[PDB]
Amino acid sequence: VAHLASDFGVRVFQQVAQASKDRNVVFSPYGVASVLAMLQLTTGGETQQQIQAAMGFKIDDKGMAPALRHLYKELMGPWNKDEISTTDAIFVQRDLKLVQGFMPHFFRLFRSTVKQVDFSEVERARFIINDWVKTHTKGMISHLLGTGAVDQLTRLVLVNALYFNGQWKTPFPDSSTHRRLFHKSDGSTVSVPMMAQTNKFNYTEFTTPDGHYYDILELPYHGDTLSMFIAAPYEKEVPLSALTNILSAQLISHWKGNMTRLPRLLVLPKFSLETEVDLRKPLENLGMTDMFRQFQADFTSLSDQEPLHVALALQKVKIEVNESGTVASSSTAVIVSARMAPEEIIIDRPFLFVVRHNPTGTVLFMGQVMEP
Amino acid sequence: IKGGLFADIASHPWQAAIFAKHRRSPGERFLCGGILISSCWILSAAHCFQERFPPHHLTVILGRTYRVVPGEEEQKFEVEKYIVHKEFDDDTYDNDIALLQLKSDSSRCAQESSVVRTVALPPADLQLPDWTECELSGYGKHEALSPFYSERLKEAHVRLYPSSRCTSQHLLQRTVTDNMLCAGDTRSGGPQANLHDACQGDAGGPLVCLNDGRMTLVGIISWGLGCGQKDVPGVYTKVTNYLDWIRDNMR
The missing domain is CATH 3.30.497.10 (Antithrombin, subunit I, domain 2)
Known part of the structure; x- marks a missing residue:
């Protein structure tokens, strides 16, 4: 029912995506x-x-x-x-x-x-x-x-x-937000602010039919009603619109399916788009x-x-990503x-995201983050 | 280890490093500290293994000063098996203790030297006087935000907080049980103020105090709201509560 509308709207996103080069959509x-x-x-x-x-x-x-x-x-x-x-x-x-x-x-x-x-x-x-x-x-x-x-x-x-603004099931401590070298698509590199948190996160590794791997990762919002799903490629040369244009409502469900809850050090850039x-x-x-x-x-x-x-x-x-509202x-x-040493997961490459309404699987938001 | 100073493994010859093999790449990454209590066994923290590697993925390294340079007289082991406590709580970190058995042929695994030796387990009737100073060791981060873990073993000195000061009131609303133990640096804070504390990557390492003139294992690094904060102690696993357990999990 609602997957139909989301998937349509994905198609709409694809069209803009391909037209918008390597730009923030x-x-x-x-x-x-x-x-x-x-x-x-x-x-x-x-x-x-x-x-x-x-x-x-x-x-x-x-x-x-x-x-x-x-x-x-x-x-x-x-x-x-x-x-x-x-x-x-x-x-x-x-x-x-x-x-x-x-x-x-x-x-x-x-x-x-x-x-x-x-x-x-x-x-x-x-x-x-x-x-x-x-x-x-x-x-x-x-x-x-x-x-x-x-x-x-x-x-x-x-x-x-x-x-849309966040409000995370597990917010990032403001204390720990540091400037960090993000690398853009072309090659360059920017000192962006990146919040860090060592928690347990739903993760899975996805590959497209063409041997392109991404880290898929779910960061739920309070009560798990909305989730944001970040999706970033292993090595930096991989185009997003490689995933973005097989993206689908039951694709997202496929990810939550394969997810297991694992302890990781997540590092992720604040942004406002x-x-x-x-x-x-x-x-x-x-x-x-x-x-x-x-x-x-x-x-x-x-x-x-x-x-x-x-x-x-x-x-x-x-959309706004930070930690919810001033709260901190x-x-x-x-x-x-x-105090264990955990597997890091750092987000210094451009990536994309999706926000979801988990009960219905409705795809509320989408985007390429090419640079904060 | 936040604060303190670099070390030699010979000053802490029961400290062990635990490594876990990667999952796409060849090779291990540093996981946790460990403590040699018997020749063929080491204690560590439970929560190090929340991601339940099969043992064969795990390697233990005794007798090594640098976390990634092989030590000349070090002693490296394949894990045969490991036993996470049955009632480890993965949210409160209650019952945070594990047991790694070293894979060897001959009922004799590690062996004593100037850099590898077992540390005494405390007597069950142990109650130490409050604010007793103890030490601890780790390859962990120097500060909570440090990109990388230590290039080398560090040591620290902290004092056992009394029970009344190990409730969650003093730990920003967080569950604390009779199985946990807080030690911390009770000096005056700045900053600057380099308050001795363990940090990310020190969990599983030892907290050793003098008793009877004998260095005796009292706690296992576990959690804290790390590293090295405002008279916010570092929490440990009360090793004495687990003496029967430990016994009962070597058969």
Whole structure:
């Protein structure tokens, strides 16, 4: 059910990944899919059948809408200590003539509404949008550069944003964070700050079909509800997009399967990443061309009055890795504790990560960390 | 070993190094300290083996000053077998003690010399006077954050804290049992302040104190919130609680 959406969103990530060279990407495979599924309702004929193709389901089919809702339900959040924050929002022109019985049916499936603004008066289409995000992402995301391209002929526009911050089952002691030589892909080397902790961690070694090994490692968040999975190659010449483009929702499950809980000295770099994505090409790469075309976009289920096309569609993600929120050594956490010499695991190469909703296997975040 | 000073194995001839073979690469990496109590046996810490290597992966090295240079008169052993305490707790480190039997032919493994010799096990009726000074030895890190482990054996001196000062109150809320024992450096702290403590990689090593004018094994390095902190003692395995056990696990 929810693996379908995640895996779709992975595909979305692949497209951006390959376009973004050796650059910091962060992305939400849930985020992307949760709005496309929405926009699915608001489309017709081949425009729809295009995006249902890519996704692999009809939000229209039985139980399928309930699912997402109920997922969203969990994410926010009595256990979620202002840690995540989602939003999905579609906007359209204020004064328009929509089909009879749709916007209610749409509320029925998603329980949200489709937001109606005035694009003619551009100054505060922009504000309105950048402050929808602002409100729903607890201010952690405010601006949104891609909205610049909003004009007055711009009439249908789609947004998705999430801000995630840690809160580890086992946090790193602040005491022990030291600057450390990270090596970038090209060759160079940067003195980045890297937190260290000697605990017990779920680990496994994975190899792709092509003889590429990575260290896979799970760092769970409090109550084990969310996990982050880091994945870094043995030797530094191995491309990430070697794994990244066989990545999958049941791939992640494959890792947790092979994991055993082992005592290791983990060394890992703090980082803070924010990517805004223009979804057009990515989505068009998947064969979703119709939605952005003036003449050909079928939005008749919500439209009636025509044409009506997606001018702009965007995602803005922000992940933060440190140790949760200012908190720092309670002192609960501490550097070594028990005094054996353990196998180190150092993360000075570029790697990638995934954040997961372990109960449902839903893939919430993703990224290449090419340099902190 | 945080604080203290480098050493000669001859000053601590029961200290052993324990090595574990890698898992992709050829070769061993340093694992734990160990203590020669009988010719063919060594004590160590339980938690050294949380990752349950088969014995054949383990090598013990007696009589060696440098952790990676072979000593001239050293004595190297393949482990025949090892016995982790049945009720070692992998979260509180309660019952932290192991027994390694050395693989040899002839019921006679290590042999005495100026650099390899067994240390006396304490008498069961041993109760030492509080703040008694004891020593300890290890190849471990010099400070909690040091990238690498020691290039050479170090020694340290600490004093046995009294029971009242070995509760978890004095260990930042952490379980402490009648099987554990805290020693630490009771001098004035700075910093600077190089408070003698063991560190990462010293676990399994000995804590030896004078009694009857006889160097006698009192504790086994175990845990701490290391290394060398604010009158936060280093925790040890009370060796006396395990005398019957040890006996009963050599048959």
